[PDB]
């Protein structure tokens, strides 16, 4: 199609490897570019950790209000929110919000621990039918994004389908679903990624991700005004270990997708 030619050309101009999956919920059609290739998830994995805790709260009604201590030893490389609560507590809700809306790495590690380790996050994925997602490490080492390394990867197709189920489907209870959507809509790190390639009137909830090898990711649910929502996953990684982020590629891919609709 025209879109796949344009995405292929974008990829060629960028010098990296681009993965795209769009689901149009109107007719359930899919647009895929390298949709079945594995990409390092980096912080896009945090959506799975938050959703897993949300699933736990369906039975543990008060779980999200459970205070969790933030100790200096818990601090890793990027903790914009946890930093503000060292030697104090944050609720599991506040940690989920920090993981999603500020990409706090310490918060992500507390969610993993709540789930009993990375195997606990991966288990939730299998439970909702995602047999591709795999989380193997904690922050910050899950961001190494080494070419060919299957650890901490998923495919654009698998992630799009799963993000659809979590936000638009019923993988989560109604209250949990609404909370996840509210959290994603309030993401603060995505202004230069998918959002930048779309009309300003469209409502977007997304989770960005970055890591080594110039890995630059964004996954988003999109509510166009008057139109059925869309799910868009954009994964991008590069061959140089110290390559710079390329959020512009994510915006250009989003723009090319928006043109085809």
Ligand X SMILES: *[B@@]1([O])O[C][C]([C][O])O1
Binding site for ligand X (CB under 6 A): 42-43, 77-78, 103, 105, 140, 143, 209-211
Cα–Cα dist 36/41, whole Å: 14
Residue nearer to ligand X on the CB measure, 133 or 168: 133
The residue behind tokens 């590690």 is 109
Ranked by CB distance to ligand X, the top (closest) residue is 43
Q: Is 96 a catalytic residue?
A: no
Q: Which of 1, 14, 43, 96 is catalytic?
A: 43
Residue whose structure tokens are 């650890």: 151
Three-state DSSP string of the chain: CHHHHHHHHHHHHHCCEEEEEEEECCCCEEEEECCCCCEECHHHHHHHHHHHHHHHHCCCCCHHHCEEEECHHHCCCCCCCHHHHCCEEEEHHHHHHHHHHCCCHHHHHHHHHHCCCHHHHHHHHHHCCCCCCCCCCCCCHHHCCCCCCCCCEECHHHHHHHHHHHHCCCCCCHHHHHHHHHHHHCCCCCCCCHHHHCCCCCEEEEEEEECCCCCEEEEEEEECCCCCCEEEEEEEECCCCCCCCCHHHHHHHHHHHHHCC
Which residue, 118 or 211, is less far from ligand X as judged by CB?
Answer: 211
Token pair 């079945």 is found at: 36
**CB closer to ligand X out of 57 and 143:** 143
Q: How far apart are CA 124 and CA 68, in angstroms?
A: 21
Q: Give the residue with the Cβ less far from ligand X, 96 or 210.
A: 210
* Distance of closest approach, residue 70 Cβ to ligand X, in angstroms: 17
Smallest distance, ligand X to C-beta of residue 151, A: 14
Shortest Å, Cβ 250 to ligand X: 13
CB of 236 to ligand X, least distance (A): 13
Shortest Cβ 81–ligand X spacing (Å): 12
Nearer to ligand X, 39 or 78 (CB): 78
Mind telling me the catalytic residues?
43
């Amino acid at each position: 199609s025209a879109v796949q030619q344009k995405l292929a050309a974008l990829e060629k101009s960028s010098g990296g490897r681009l993965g795209v999956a769009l689901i149009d919920t109107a007719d359930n059609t899919q647009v895929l570019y390298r949709g079945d290739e594995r990409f390092p998830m980096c912080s896009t994995s945090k959506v799975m950790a938050a959703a897993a805790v949300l699933k736990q709260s369906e039975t543990q009604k008060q779980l999200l209000n459970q205070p969790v201590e933030i100790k200096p030893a818990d601090l890793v490389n990027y903790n914009p929110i946890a930093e503000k609560h060292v030697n104090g507590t944050m609720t599991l809700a506040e940690l989920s919000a920090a993981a999603l809306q500020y990409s706090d790495n310490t918060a992500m590690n507390k969610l993993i621990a709540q789930l009993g380790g990375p195997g606990g996050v991966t288990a939730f994925a299998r439970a909702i039918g995602d047999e591709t997602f795999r989380l193997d490490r904690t922050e910050p080492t899950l961001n190494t994004a080494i070419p060919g390394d299957p650890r901490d990867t998923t495919t654009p197709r698998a992630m799009a389908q799963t993000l659809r189920q979590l936000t638009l489907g019923h993988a989560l209870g109604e209250t949990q679903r609404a909370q996840l959507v509210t959290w994603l809509k309030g993401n603060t790190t995505g202004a230069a990624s998918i959002r930048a390639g779309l009309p300003t009137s469209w409502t977007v909830g997304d989770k960005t991700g970055s890591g080594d090898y110039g890995t630059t990711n964004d996954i988003a649910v999109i509510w166009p005004q008057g139109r059925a929502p869309l799910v868009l996953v954009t994964y991008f990684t590069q061959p140089q270990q110290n390559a710079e982020s390329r959020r512009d590629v994510l915006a250009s891919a989003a723009r090319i997708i928006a043109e085809g609709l």
